[PDB]
Amino acid sequence: RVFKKSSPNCKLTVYLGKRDFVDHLDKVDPVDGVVLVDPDYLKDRKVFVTLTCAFRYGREDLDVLGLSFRKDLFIANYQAFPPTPNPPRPPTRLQERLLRKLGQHAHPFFFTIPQNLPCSVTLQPGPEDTGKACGVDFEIRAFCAKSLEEKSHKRNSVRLVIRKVQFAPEKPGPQPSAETTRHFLMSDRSLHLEASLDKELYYHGEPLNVNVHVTNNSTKTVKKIKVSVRQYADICLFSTAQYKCPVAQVEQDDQVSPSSTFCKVYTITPLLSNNREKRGLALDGKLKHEDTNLASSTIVKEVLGILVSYRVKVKLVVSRGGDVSVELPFVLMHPKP
Amino acid sequence: RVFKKSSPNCKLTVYLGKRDFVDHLDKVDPVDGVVLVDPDYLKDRKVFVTLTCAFRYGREDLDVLGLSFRKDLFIANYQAFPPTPNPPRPPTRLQERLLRKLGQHAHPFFFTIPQNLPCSVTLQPGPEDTGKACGVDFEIRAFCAKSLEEKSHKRNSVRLVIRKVQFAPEKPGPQPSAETTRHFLMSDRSLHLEASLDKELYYHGEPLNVNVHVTNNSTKTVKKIKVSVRQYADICLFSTAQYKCPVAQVEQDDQVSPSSTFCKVYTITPLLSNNREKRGLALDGKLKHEDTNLASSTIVKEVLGILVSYRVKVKLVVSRGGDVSVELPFVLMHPKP
Amino acid sequence: RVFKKSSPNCKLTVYLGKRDFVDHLDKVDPVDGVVLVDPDYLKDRKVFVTLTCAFRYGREDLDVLGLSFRKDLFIANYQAFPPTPNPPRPPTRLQERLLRKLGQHAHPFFFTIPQNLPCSVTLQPGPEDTGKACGVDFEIRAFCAKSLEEKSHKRNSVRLVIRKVQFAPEKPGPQPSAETTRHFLMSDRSLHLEASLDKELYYHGEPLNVNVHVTNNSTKTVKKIKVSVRQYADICLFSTAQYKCPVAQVEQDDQVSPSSTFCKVYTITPLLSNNREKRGLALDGKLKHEDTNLASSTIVKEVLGILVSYRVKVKLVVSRGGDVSVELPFVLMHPKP
Ligand SMILES: O=P(O)(O)O[C@H]1[C@H](OP(=O)(O)O)[C@@H](OP(=O)(O)O)[C@H](OP(=O)(O)O)[C@@H](OP(=O)(O)O)[C@H]1OP(=O)(O)O
Ligand SMILES: O=P(O)(O)O[C@H]1[C@H](OP(=O)(O)O)[C@@H](OP(=O)(O)O)[C@H](OP(=O)(O)O)[C@@H](OP(=O)(O)O)[C@H]1OP(=O)(O)O
Ligand SMILES: O=P(O)(O)O[C@H]1[C@H](OP(=O)(O)O)[C@@H](OP(=O)(O)O)[C@H](OP(=O)(O)O)[C@@H](OP(=O)(O)O)[C@H]1OP(=O)(O)O
Ligand SMILES: O=P(O)(O)O[C@H]1[C@H](OP(=O)(O)O)[C@@H](OP(=O)(O)O)[C@H](OP(=O)(O)O)[C@@H](OP(=O)(O)O)[C@H]1OP(=O)(O)O
Ligand SMILES: O=P(O)(O)O[C@H]1[C@H](OP(=O)(O)O)[C@@H](OP(=O)(O)O)[C@H](OP(=O)(O)O)[C@@H](OP(=O)(O)O)[C@H]1OP(=O)(O)O
Ligand SMILES: O=P(O)(O)O[C@H]1[C@H](OP(=O)(O)O)[C@@H](OP(=O)(O)O)[C@H](OP(=O)(O)O)[C@@H](OP(=O)(O)O)[C@H]1OP(=O)(O)O
């Protein structure tokens, strides 16, 4: 339908046409909206609308102490009333539709979301956390004041969360494929591991099929085989820290004897619902009263923000040392609607 | 009876007449006590008594790193032995009673608690926290040394926690009453919410009766009604952060159809016992092996400290947008004994 | 057997003769090992081996913000290939054994662990923590690069955790024995507590026998008796903080009437398995996929590090005030193999 929220006193309502604004890499969907204000209520006050992209990292108690990392990556402030020159660019048919039903006390606003900006990512809070979640969020905020500097008023202000999202590219990428050979010393023996995925791109909730082939031309015994999907979150503040969290694991007592080959497909699905306990897991941005998913793969630089990526790991568990592994990068994304 | 505690080696005991010292706004009950020392034990050492009002904010691991906020808001140091001039002001009948039963090795001490000081508030720790709790505490400390600068000794020192408390004013304040009207666009329609409490002041454990009246002269349908009590903790460090935590909620699928009125009382009771899981909730100061309650409303400025306050929220849940709300400030306090 | 681990790509393996290196107080077992490299893989790159003793304190989110305390207490960097002069000192019979089976692409390395260094201690993480644990750890790291400054590569590098450990001295120390007398005012009454352990040194998992004797020549009634073992962790960063955590408790409603004596042995055993919930408890260093124990007593200065020590507390619970206590230091250590 149309998305709208009011101030607590109801003197102020913001309408938007949607909450998700798609990053097309060359450009982003612009935010076209309308603020409706009560006339006699603001009086000499002005109506401002603000678009903020904010990046916060740190627990709630670090907020009070001024220790958490809080940076606005993007701020645009718009004086919507008293009305201003019309560009940019026209009014969209949604604004026109809304300015008619609401009348002269409705006022359009327009923002472009800069492309060089992270997408909406929520870092999953633990059950104890009570503040707002760490990550990158976007917020449309409308309020009434004499000037931008005047402090905030809760009763007058509407805060509205929106999201910058990306969708799977249309061009299929190259097939993920990796291999690792453990050579053994003087003898010509070796323990060979090959693995691959059918494709580079998977959709949330779609099972990955991991092709595993083991050539054990050695005297060691593979005693377990472990297949996992790991999330990689690059947190870029002053220094970029990379956090890894497994989000799916199949572990079987499959054995590969000496002088033997082994070939199987392992099917595995990364789901947020098996990971609601992992603090700090990257989630696609938290919306109102909706459910989210594991954060989509970022389509790219180490500017401030959060970059998310995924890999399959296949590990051959050998006794003592001797373990063998490959990793398979893939992409995890929603399909374009 | 009389409150007393000894050092671990028992060479030193502090007696006080009570643990709660009442803030009367114009003044505070003074701390009149006695320290009993073993004569031959201190020898050339002096006996000091200290009254400290301390304000700490931050988890335990931040202590070690020097990151937590720790400020003594008030320190008074008293050399009780070798004895000193008698004022102020006399000895109280409690000190006289105690100096008789204990004799020449008992020594009085006297402190005034400055009024411009927060009251005792404990921030509720999570099950994981193991240090002392954040908040504002008062401590009488007695110990033996050559001078005040000499470092602390656990075996010699007695630490005794006391509380600065407030009680409900005698004059009833004005009846809490609020209203919010959602006007609808061009049509003369409206969705009106009125609410009130019988009184401004409630006692811990006393039920609040929330009078709710809804006039739905609109086409929208109230589908749920939500009544809650929220604690508001103003944490004033360098910047004042306000934390909110609900501590009671009634949520019913009560509906208010278009062109209809609705009138009901909702009864709701904020109890700590339904909130033992909420980390950082403001509690009246933690005493020894006793149970506490939700922190009392502060009777007032943004000096360093913790200010606590309470509100009822009444929310009419309407589909899509359209929600309507009022808030009702009230005071929550113990009655004066 | 022999301990070995490879890089993820298997081009690089580090062998060591053991993982625990014993601090003999006058000196430490040296780390004698071998790195095996694939010849054509490194090409123009060099092989380095690093011995690092690291000290980290702080939760995971403080890492990203640069707030945690991270200090390398000791770093030694060794260019093992292209080979270098032979001392020190010879090659051990383990290196010789290994250089034969592996051949010319195996290269010895040798490190002395400085004595003035803490032992391996892990601070017990909570279930929520996901990073590496706080405490003091030692790590052998081998990798391929042109120079030491070149950044790290995960596929090339092997990381291997080792431990600096201590064992119980051979000379028995003096018997722990303490006493505390509560004298009562004017009357010649008194409440006397004596306690002792059979010995100063106990082994992990060995029960302590606490000899308790109470002479109640007073009018007060001991109503409970509490015996506990407490861990004391001195965390020495910029300022040394001492953290205490009980790790065993016997609490009985044993009573000692006025004009009565009382004599009993209380047996108590500190076990990690009854304390897996205590965040920050000092543990002997966490090895790979093994189980650990409560940290051993440190055999000593307040340099940077973690010092661990233990005491029995015996407390006589008297009504109102009047409690009486002693503490008994003891040592808790593994026997030398
Ligand atoms: O606006 P936020 O700071 O995100 O806080 C909101 C807000 O609480 P306030 O009344 O303090 O503004 C909601 O109220 P509305 O503005 O929506 O009326 C409230 O109520 P709802 O549940 O009805 O949305 C909701 O509380 P809850 O925890 O029950 O969701 C709560 O959310 P947070 O405090 O959790 O952000
Ligand atoms: O212990 P593992 O890692 O499984 O490997 C060992 C190792 O052989 P590698 O050189 O391949 O590690 C032993 O070699 P030594 O160091 O003992 O010389 C060898 O002993 P032999 O050389 O006498 O064969 C032993 O065999 P085992 O432990 O069964 O006696 C063999 O394990 P596998 O030969 O079973 O692989
Ligand atoms: O004095 P605090 O620093 O607040 O610590 C006390 C104190 O422990 P110490 O023995 O280290 O001083 C109590 O001992 P007393 O001074 O009262 O003899 C002890 O024992 P009680 O339980 O008998 O009071 C209690 O331990 P517990 O955790 O069992 O209450 C503990 O409290 P905290 O360490 O939790 O503050
Ligand atoms: O979707 P809601 O927020 O419940 O309100 C809508 C909205 O009316 P408002 O202007 O009061 O929001 C629609 O207006 P349009 O934007 O679609 O013009 C209206 O449609 P009509 O104008 O055709 O009546 C629709 O009615 P419905 O969704 O039942 O077709 C009506 O809901 P109510 O009229 O039931 O309040
Ligand atoms: O090397 P670390 O940084 O300590 O991390 C390791 C490592 O994960 P990577 O694949 O990211 O290096 C292990 O892999 P190997 O180097 O041993 O192949 C992995 O797998 P294992 O379980 O097979 O040891 C293990 O994951 P797990 O959590 O399952 O132990 C994990 O440990 P941490 O991330 O917990 O340190
Ligand atoms: O309350 P407790 O700490 O158990 O000790 C009290 C206290 O005696 P102490 O001086 O030893 O503390 C009372 O002394 P007063 O301050 O009341 O003078 C005394 O009262 P009497 O002096 O009248 O004996 C009272 O006795 P009770 O409370 O049973 O009347 C006695 O407790 P015990 O005498 O039982 O130890």
Author numbering:
A (entry chain A), B (entry chain A), C (entry chain A): 8 to 307, 313 to 349
Provide the authors' original text about this structure.
Arrestins modulate G protein-coupled receptor (GPCR) signaling in two ways. First, arrestins bind to activated, phosphorylated receptor and sterically block G protein coupling, terminating G protein activation. GPCR-dependent arrestin signaling occurs in the context of a complex between arrestin and phosphorylated, activated GPCR. Structures of all four vertebrate arrestins in the basal state4, 6–8 showed that arrestin is a two-domain protein with limited interaction between domains.
To address these questions, we determined the 2.4 Å resolution crystal structure of arrestin-3 in complex with the non-receptor activator inositol hexakisphosphate (IP6). To test whether IP6 could activate arrestin-3, we determined the structure to 2.4 Å resolution, which shows that the IP6-arrestin-3 complex is a trimer. In the structure, we identified electron density consistent with two bound IP6 molecules per arrestin; each IP6 molecule is located between the protomers of the arrestin trimer. The structure shows that IP6 binds to arrestin-3 at the same location as C-tail in basal arrestin such that IP6 displaces the C-tail. The IP6-bound structure exhibits an inter-domain twist of 17.7° with respect to the basal conformation. Moreover, the IP6 binding sites in the N-domain overlap with the binding sites for phosphorylated receptor. Critically, phosphate binding recruits Lys295 of the lariat loop, which contains two out of five charged residues in the polar core. This interaction likely elicits a conformational change that disrupts the polar core and triggers the phosphate sensor. Similarly, in the IP6-mediated trimer the finger loop is presented as an α-helix. In this conformation, hydrophobic residues would be exposed to solvent if the IP6-activated arrestin-3 were a monomer, but in the context of the trimer, these form Van der Waals (<4 Å) self-contacts around the molecular three-fold axis and are shielded from solvent.
